[PDB]
Amino acid sequence: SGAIYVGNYRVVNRHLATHNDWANLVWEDSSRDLLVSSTTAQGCDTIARCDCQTGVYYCSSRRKHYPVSFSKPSLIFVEASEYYPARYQSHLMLAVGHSEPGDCGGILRCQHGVVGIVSTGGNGLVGFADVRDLLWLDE
């Protein structure tokens, strides 16, 4: 679990979004596993605006942060679940690292701010949904 709070927005994995998230829906994209809902309280997370390929993510299944090198956002394949049919997923970045289902939502950050959130895992790889292109989160 986990979310990014920036301005009056809350960014979560679309597969983990709550009823309250869907009732205050701003935008969602099933192909990116992202959902953004509106909030009443002001958020203070800073979103990175960069092409960094190194950063640190939080891994709840180890209560630890790990430094990683990660790929550029791209279209990658993902197997089925109670949540999605087998399909690709866009704006996804992979890194070599530990992840488990409950790890989705963990933040990946670089020196510039928040880069994205854990969205996929398996086979010793972890995948992050990128949020750096969502320029409207800041306005």
Ligand X SMILES: NC(=O)[C@H]1CCCN(C(=O)Nc2cccc3c2S(=O)(=O)CCC3)C1
Q: 87 and 78 in contact (C-beta within 8 Å)?
A: yes
From ligand X, Zn ion, none, which one binds at residue 37 (CB under 5 to 8 Å depending on kind)?
A: none
Gap between the Cα atoms of 20 and 36, Å rounded? 11
Number of chain positions touching Zn ion (CB under 5 A): 5
Number of chain positions touching ligand X (CB under 6 A): 16
Say if residue 19 carries a ligand binding annotation: no
Binding part of the chain for Zn ion, among 31-39, 79-87, 92-100, 112-120 by CB under 5 A, reads: 112-120
Q: Is 56 in the site for Zn ion (CB under 5 A)?
A: no
Gap between the Cα atoms of 9 and 12, Å rounded? 10
Residue 104 among the catalytic residues: yes
Q: Is 50 in the site for Zn ion (CB under 5 A)?
A: yes
Count of beta carbons in the 10 Å neighbourhood of residue 118: 27
Q: Which is nearer to Zn ion, 26 or 52 (CB)?
A: 52
Gap between the Cα atoms of 77 and 82, Å rounded? 17
Residue 33 among the catalytic residues: yes
Amino acid at 1: S
Q: What is the DSSP letter of 23?
A: H
N- to C-terminal Cα distance for the chain? 26
From ligand X, Zn ion, none, which one binds at residue 50 (CB under 5 to 8 Å depending on kind)?
A: Zn ion
Catalytic residues: 15, 33, 104
| Footprint of ligand X (CB under 6 A) | 15, 33, 78, 81, 83-84, 89, 99-101, 103-104, 119-122
